[PDB]
A paper describes a structure:
N-methyl-D-aspartate receptors (NMDARs) belong to the family of ionotropic glutamate receptors (iGluRs) that are involved in the majority of fast excitatory neurotransmission. NMDARs form heterotetrameric ion channels composed of the obligatory GluN1 subunits and GluN2 (A-D) and/or GluN3 (A-B) subunits. All of the subunits contain an amino-terminal domain (ATD), a ligand-binding domain (LBD), a transmembrane domain (TMD), and a carboxyl-terminal domain (CTD), which interact with each other in defined manners to mediate functions including channel gating, allosteric modulation, and cellular signaling. More recently, a number of studies on intact tetrameric NMDARs showed that the subunits are arranged as a dimer of GluN1-GluN2 heterodimers and that domains and subunits move in discrete patterns to control channel gating and allosteric modulation.
To understand the underlying factors that contribute to the different effects exhibited by IgG2 and IgG5, we sought to determine the binding site for IgG5. For this, we implemented single-particle cryo-EM on the intact GluN1b-GluN2B NMDAR-Fab5 complex and x-ray crystallography on the GluN1b-GluN2B ATD complexed to Fab5. The cryo-EM structure of GluN1b-GluN2B NMDAR-Fab5 was obtained at resolutions ranging from 4.45 to 7.51 Å as estimated by Fourier shell correlation (FSC) curves. Although the overall quality of the cryo-EM density is inferior to that of GluN1b-GluN2B NMDAR-Fab2, it is sufficient to capture patterns of conformational alteration. a–b Cryo-EM density of non-active2-like 3D class at overall resolution of 4.45 Å from the ‘side’ and ‘top’ of the N-terminus. Densities for TMD, LBD, and ATD of GluN1b (magenta) and GluN2B (dark green) and Fab5 heavy chain (gray) and light chain (dark gold) were observed. The structure was solved in the presence of 1 mM glycine and glutamate. c The molecular model built based on the cryo-EM density in the same color code as in panels a and b. d Zoomed view of the ATD-Fab5 interaction site. The cryo-EM data for the GluN1b-GluN2B NMDAR-Fab5 in the presence of glycine and glutamate was classified into four 3D classes, where one corresponds to active, another is similar to nonactive, and the other two are similar to nonactive. This conformational pattern is similar to that of the GluN1b-GluN2B NMDAR with no antibodies bound, thus, is consistent with the observation that IgG5 does not mediate inhibition and instead has a small potentiating effect on the function of GluN1b-GluN2B NMDARs. Although both IgG2 and IgG5 bind the GluN2B ATD, they do so at distinct locations.
Author numbering:
A (entry chain A): 25 to 52, 58 to 94, 103 to 186, 209 to 558
B (entry chain H): 3 to 116
C (entry chain D): 755 to 803
D (entry chain D): 461 to 509
E (entry chain B): 34 to 206, 213 to 394, 403 to 441, 450 to 460
F (entry chain A): 711 to 812
G (entry chain L): 1 to 112
The structure:
């Protein structure tokens, strides 16, 4: 009962330690080690892929450094693979069926530790910037799964990868009442934000910053402000440890597999035969149920993607060019106590707070009787209007849209206001509150949740779109209350009862 | 690399040979051009060639008023114009093109055809 | 014409999570008009008009 | 309002118990202490009013 | 002068190749088709890649089309990797070439063919609108692309005036599957799966008791796999489309792909002076392939030949194909229903095919008891709380919108 | 529009009224006086004001909805409780009725 | 035919500024995944080369005091900050299928 195993490896020392691990796992049932070099070119790897498949006794292939032009052939023959040096999340789609049971996580799984940062903090003023990529989109859906249970502050910020364009986009992020920044992009976009946030002073006091691992490189390290807390995967480079553990897992698998029925070996050679070798996925099912008690990298176990079961995370703080290792994340167990945290504002403590503003934007539409949009005077002021008792009625600036007429979006008009609820807000701001800002909506609609035609999106329009997008903060309007608007938006007590 | 050879003053309806010495690369796989710079700085076209000698292309208004020949061994392109009117008094540039190649990577200095 | 704008409301103290359920259920009940029929069963007089 | 509560108990799928007010009327506050249904619910029984 | 290969694997009609091949329809524009014929018999994708590399794809031919007769899936990956490394176009014609519907990155090319699954979902609604019959249940397997057309069709019904409803979408892959199939009360069960999956589910659903007479199934051809078999368990009178390539045969699809290559070549060469040369070695180019940001799919996506705009999407799905709707038979594997061609539905007899509960009711319109409106011009059907009329065209399908007291 | 879409019993008339729908209320306000328009549907808060103010219109009662005018904020704001407390405070002095007079 | 035009064709700003130069045309040319215009810049008389290939792709031996963006029918270039050797005329080129489409030219000086 001798079983061959291929392993696409870079140097011969790897193939030597592969052969020695085969002889060590031959303690139980015999094994066999064939040596596969790592090809420098893609089509040459697709050339030499099935010259090793002449030996049909290969039942698993280890790969290393993209391994795209070789992983498809193994999933085409349903061979269980291990992608050892994979930090790419495109293979995490297991609907391709050219994937593997996971080693160390590709990139996005550190965001679970980012969700466990609120176990230290319980912060709920958190802004997220995503570079627009599929791996970023997978991290988006990962965070949306992580939130469903709080730190439920702000939706998203989008970013187009390939341009600089930070300040023109994210100048709004200076104003959005929150201090927690989470970066998820490439290292070059990280340096672009680093220099633009240096231009915008967005890495000052209060501003706490959270990054991942692949943003941390020397180009970004020159531009990283001293105080950023960074992550690092335990055993990112000890490849031979993952080699020997992979030999022990496949030896556990073939230990279970040599006590089974209907072996039905692959064809010798890649071709000249059928390609629907049926015990392929069943061996992957056995590898899915295969476990590992303990290794040099620890206890290797498998999640639904096969992922590594509290992959430990060394955490560093860049303090005066030196990444001071803050301590070890181990799942439920936290970075305990040992090292002092320097924060990016010269601070020594965690900023437990945010900036509740005394300036909020109250945007609404024109509605007689409660709103009479009046044209301003020659100096832009208001005509002094009296009551029936001669009392000066409060005319505040209802800053209009760029329309004087719908279809001429040019006349950004001051249009100081006149109406019933104007004095109500004057009463409330006298009693409790602040110096407001007032805008008038362009389309003038209440707005319904109309279906956008872009593969099943449904977006609120009008003021409901504006408040949901954060363009407005308080909506005073003669608007009724249905369940539909109440599905997402908090309503106050109903002031004027009507029919 | 590229240097426009010739130009000068031409009469109304006259013919002129426009040459350009090329030093640095081969012709039979590479791609060049001929563009026009007016004194009013309106960027126009003179000659469109192939990357291998091959065929050529004619801009529409100047079509039939010039011909192109590529002597690939001696690395100097030739361009014999004809029927030059008053609206061809412009500085002409020879420029090597890209591998795409509708951009240009290298340039000649510029001849002056009056 | 009356001298107040008041409203009866169901009360649960501190209403942990269930406030979100009950208020949308009330807006659902107002969203169908059976409340108006309940007024025809209960809250209709003869001598006003 | 009983049938309203019946629709609410069908919508949010809750059962109940129908206990009655025995002391006080509606929550008249006496030395800072409510009687009635308000003093009932402020006795933290997770009551419903 | 465009070196073109046409490549097949078995069952060739070489005289239709010799005949189609009309130079006068390529009437001296800029190019002439330098055509070469390859025939194979391989189940050998490795030697398929290697000898084609060894062929004039490295030496002479810059563009090639390819046909099959099988049901293979990895031909998609073979397409994707040659698109990944080589700007030379390969196209899909028949067999496991047009059965390739696979999502990909922004590629250099695609096995361009007829319809999509989104076009099949739409015509499935158009048939359920025309043949007055109502979907309420779908089932799917873990095939990538299941949920988009599901969310499409359900949201499309949500914007119409009259409305289909939905019992359940069953994302599936323990024989209590029959108990989840017990909850399906719709006359229509739509399904996304494979042919071996379909035959297994046909054993399961006939073990439920929801067989071919009561609750009829509706597939696309990808679920049917090969359109020329009843493997084990196909129930009578099921519904499917691929299908106009069956009306094509060989030399119509030869005239399709050849003229598309020659036209789109003259699309580029209409004002461009030349065409990029084929690279001398496929697996050792590695410097010359980056010379061309290719971008000729601007000219490949918009090609019209003989007044037929063979226009694709970004994923090479044809925007204007023809759809032939076909029923099964108790004894045969497919017979007929009718056809579909770009928002034009042509079906046979306007009679729901069947195998007493129904009663033919004769009546006269008299308001307020009977009110006959016409159908809506946007859809062609009746609204909510209205029923279809049947009045003799003096075919009898003048169908109007009856209602009333 | 939401209420007449979700109630399928008058959905025929909801399809009929879809064909002549308006952008602002001030159009239908002028259009009733234009006398090309039989009836318009609106909340009574603006309708009984315009009946009181300009002239020459009536209403037939029959308050179908019976709703109020709350204030829209984003969810989990720190500005719900004290704001609605001030709503009560504005009710508990008649100042609401004062602005009603004015 | 598509026609590129440049704006503003003549200006002069001081040192260390955001010198933004826009270019307009008729039809959208930048569609699939690459943008389409090659910014040329050179002094009067001398041909300094291309500086931007498609939208921001810098060439060999270029400064870092400029950038280029834009899409649809409106691309632009932004010099920031402003150098002292900025007495040159700047040019636009994406052609078409249709042989070659050129823009005008933007001559810039340094305020002093």
């Amino acid at each position: 009962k001798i079983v061959n195993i291929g392993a696409v490896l870079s140097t011969r020392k790897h193939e030597q330690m592969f052969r020695e691990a085969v002889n060590q796992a031959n303690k139980r049932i015999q094994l066999q080690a064939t040596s596969v070099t790592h090809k420098p070119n893609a089509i040459q790897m697709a050339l030499s892929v099935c010259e090793d498949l002449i030996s049909s006794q290969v039942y698993a292939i280890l790969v290393s450094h993209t391994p795209t032009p070789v992983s498809y052939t193994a999933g085409f023959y349903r061979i269980p693979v291990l992608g050892l040096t994979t930090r790419m999340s495109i293979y995490s789609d297991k609907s391709i069926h050219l994937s593997f049971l996971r080693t160390v996580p590709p990139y996005s799984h550190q965001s679970s530790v980012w969700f466990e940062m609120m176990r230290v903090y319980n912060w709920n003023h958190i802004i997220l910037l995503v570079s627009d990529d599929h791996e970023g989109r997978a991290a988006q859906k990962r965070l949306e799964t992580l939130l469903e249970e709080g730190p439920k502050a702000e939706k998203v910020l989008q970013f187009d990868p390939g341009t600089k364009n930070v300040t023109a986009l994210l100048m709004e992020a200076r104003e959005l009442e929150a201090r927690v920044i989470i970066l998820s992009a490439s290292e070059d976009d990280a340096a672009t934000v680093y220099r633009a946030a240096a231009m915008l002073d967005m890495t000052g006091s209060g501003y706490v910053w959270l990054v991942g691992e692949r943003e941390i490189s020397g180009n970004a390290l020159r531009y990283a402000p001293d105080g950023i807390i960074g992550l690092q995967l335990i055993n990112g480079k000890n490849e031979s440890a993952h080699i020997s553990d992979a030999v022990g897992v496949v030896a556990q698998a073939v230990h279970e597999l040599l006590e089974k029925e209907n072996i039905t070996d692959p064809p010798r050679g890649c071709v000249g035969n059928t390609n629907i070798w049926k015990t392929g996925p069943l061996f992957k099912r056995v590898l899915m149920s295969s476990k590992y008690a303990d290794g040099v990298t620890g206890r290797v176990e498998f999640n639904e993607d096969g992922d590594r079961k509290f992959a430990q995370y060394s955490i560093m703080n860049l303090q005066n060019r030196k990444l001071v290792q803050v301590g070890i994340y181990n799942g439920t167990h936290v970075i305990p106590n040992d090292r002092k945290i320097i924060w990016p504002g010269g601070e020594t403590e965690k900023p437990r707070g945010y900036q509740m503003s005394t300036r909020l934007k109250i945007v609404t539409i024109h509605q007689e009787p409660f709103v009479y949009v009046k044209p301003t005077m020659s100096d832009g002021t208001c005509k002094e209007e009296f009551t029936v008792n001669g009392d000066p009625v409060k005319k505040v600036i209802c800053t209009g849209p760029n329309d004087t007429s719908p279809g001429s979006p040019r006349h950004t008009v001051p249009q100081c206001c006149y109406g019933f609820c104007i004095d109500l807000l004057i009463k409330l701001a006298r009693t409790m509150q602040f110096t407001y800002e007032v805008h008038l909506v362009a389309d003038g609609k209440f707005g319904t949740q109309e279906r956008v035609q872009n593969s099943n999106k449904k977006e609120w329009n009008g003021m409901m779109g504006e408040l949901l997008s954060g363009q407005a903060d308080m909506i005073v309007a003669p608007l009724t209350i249905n369940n539909e608007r109440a599905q997402y938006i908090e309503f106050s007590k109903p002031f004027k009862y009507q029919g | 690399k590229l240097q426009e050879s010739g130009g000068g003053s031409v009469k109304l309806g006259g013919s002129l040979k426009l040459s350009c010495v090329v030093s640095g690369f081969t012709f039979s796989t590479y791609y060049m051009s001929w563009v026009r710079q007016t004194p009013e700085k309106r960027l126009e076209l003179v000659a469109v060639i192939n990357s291998n000698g091959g065929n050529t292309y004619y801009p529409d208004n100047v079509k039939g008023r010039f011909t192109i020949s590529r002597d690939n061994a001696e690395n100097t392109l030739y361009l014999q114009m004809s029927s030059l009117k008053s609206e061809d008094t412009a500085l002409y540039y020879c420029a090597r093109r890209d591998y795409d190649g509708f951009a240009m990577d290298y340039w000649g200095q510029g001849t002056s055809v009056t | 014409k009356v001298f107040a704008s008041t409203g009866y409301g169901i009360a649960i103290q501190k209403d942990s999570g269930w406030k979100r359920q009950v208020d949308l259920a009330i807006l659902q009940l107002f969203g169908d008009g059976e409340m108006e029929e309940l007024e025809a069963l209960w809250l209709t007089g003869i001598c006003h008009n | 309002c009983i049938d309203i509560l019946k629709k609410i108990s069908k919508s949010v799928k809750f059962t109940y118990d129908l206990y009655l007010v025995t002391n006080g009327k509606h929550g008249k506050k006496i030395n800072g202490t409510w009687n009635g249904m308000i003093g009932e619910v402020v006795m933290k029984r997770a009551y419903m009013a | 002068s465009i070196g073109i290969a046409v490549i097949l694997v078995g069952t060739s009609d070489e005289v239709a190749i010799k005949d189609a091949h009309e130079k006068d329809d390529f009437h001296h524009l800029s190019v002439v088709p330098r055509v070469e014929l390859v025939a194979m018999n391989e189940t050998d994708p490795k030697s398929i890649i290697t000898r084609i590399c060894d062929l004039m794809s490295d030496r002479k031919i810059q563009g090639v089309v390819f046909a099959d007769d099988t049901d293979q899936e990895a031909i998609a990956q073979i397409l994707d990797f040659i698109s990944a490394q080589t700007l030379t176009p390969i196209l899909g014609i028949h067999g496991g070439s047009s059965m390739i519907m696979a999502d990909k990155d922004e590629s250099s090319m695609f096995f361009q063919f007829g319809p999509s699954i989104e076009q099949q979902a739409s015509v499935m609604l158009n048939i359920m609108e025309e043949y007055d019959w109502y979907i309420f249940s779908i089932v799917t397997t873990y095939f990538p692309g299941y949920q988009d057309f599901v969310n499409k069709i359900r949201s499309t019904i949500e914007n119409s005036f009259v409305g289909w409803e939905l019992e359940e979408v069953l994302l599936l892959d323990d024989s209590k599957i029959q108990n989840q199939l017990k909850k399906l009360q719709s006359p229509i069960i739509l399904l996304y799966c494979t042919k071996e999956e379909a035959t297994y589910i046909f054993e399961v659903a006939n073990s439920v008791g929801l067989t071919g007479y009561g609750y009829t199934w509706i597939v696309p051809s990808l679920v049917a796999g090969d359109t020329d078999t009843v493997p084990s368990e196909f129930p009578t009178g099921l519904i499917s489309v691929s299908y106009d390539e069956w009306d094509y045969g060989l030399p119509a699809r030869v005239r399709d792909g050849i003229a598309i290559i020659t036209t789109a070549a003259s699309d580029m060469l209409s004002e461009h002076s030349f065409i990029p040369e084929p690279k001398s070695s496929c697996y050792n180019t590695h410097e010359k392939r980056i010379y061309q940001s290719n971008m000729l799919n601007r000219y490949l996506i918009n090609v019209t030949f003989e007044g037929r705009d063979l226009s694709f999407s970004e994923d090479g799905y044809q925007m204007h194909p023809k759809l032939v709707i076909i029923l099964l038979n108790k004894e045969r594997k497919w017979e007929r229903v009718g056809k579909w061609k770009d928002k034009s539905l042509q079906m046979k007899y306007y009679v729901w095919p069947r195998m007493d509960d129904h009663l033919s009711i004769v009546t006269l319109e008299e308001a307020p008891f009977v009110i006959v409106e016409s159908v809506d011009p946007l859809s062609g059907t009746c609204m909510r709380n209205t029923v279809p009329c049947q009045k003799r065209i003096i075919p009898g399908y003048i169908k109007k919108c009856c209602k009333g007291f | 529009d939401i209420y007449f879409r979700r109630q399928v019993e008058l959905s025929t008339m909801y399809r009929h009224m879809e064909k002549h729908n308006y952008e602002s209320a001030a159009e239908a306000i002028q259009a009733v006086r234009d006398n090309k328009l039989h009836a318009f549907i609106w909340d009574s808060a603006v309708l009984e004001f315009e009946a009181s103010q300009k002239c020459d219109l009536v209403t037939t009662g029959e308050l179908f909805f019976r709703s109020g005018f709350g204030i829209g904020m984003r969810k989990d704001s720190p500005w719900k409780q004290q704001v609605s407390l001030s709503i009560l405070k504005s009710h508990e002095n008649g100042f609401m009725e004062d602005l009603d007079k004015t | 035919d598509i026609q590129l035009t440049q704006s503003p064709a003549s200006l002069a700003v001081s040192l260390g500024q955001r010198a933004t130069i826009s270019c307009r045309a008729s039809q959208s040319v930048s569609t699939s995944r690459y943008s389409y215009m090659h910014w040329y810049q050179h002094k009067p008389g001398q041909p300094p080369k291309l500086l931007i290939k498609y939208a921001s792709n810098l060439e060999s031996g270029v400064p870092a005091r400029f950038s280029g963006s834009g899409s649809g029918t409106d691309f632009t270039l932004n010099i920031h900050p402003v150098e002292e050797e900025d007495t040159a005329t700047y040019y636009c080129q994406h052609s078409w299928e249709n042989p070659y489409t050129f823009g005008g030219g933007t001559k810039l000086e340094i305020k002093r």
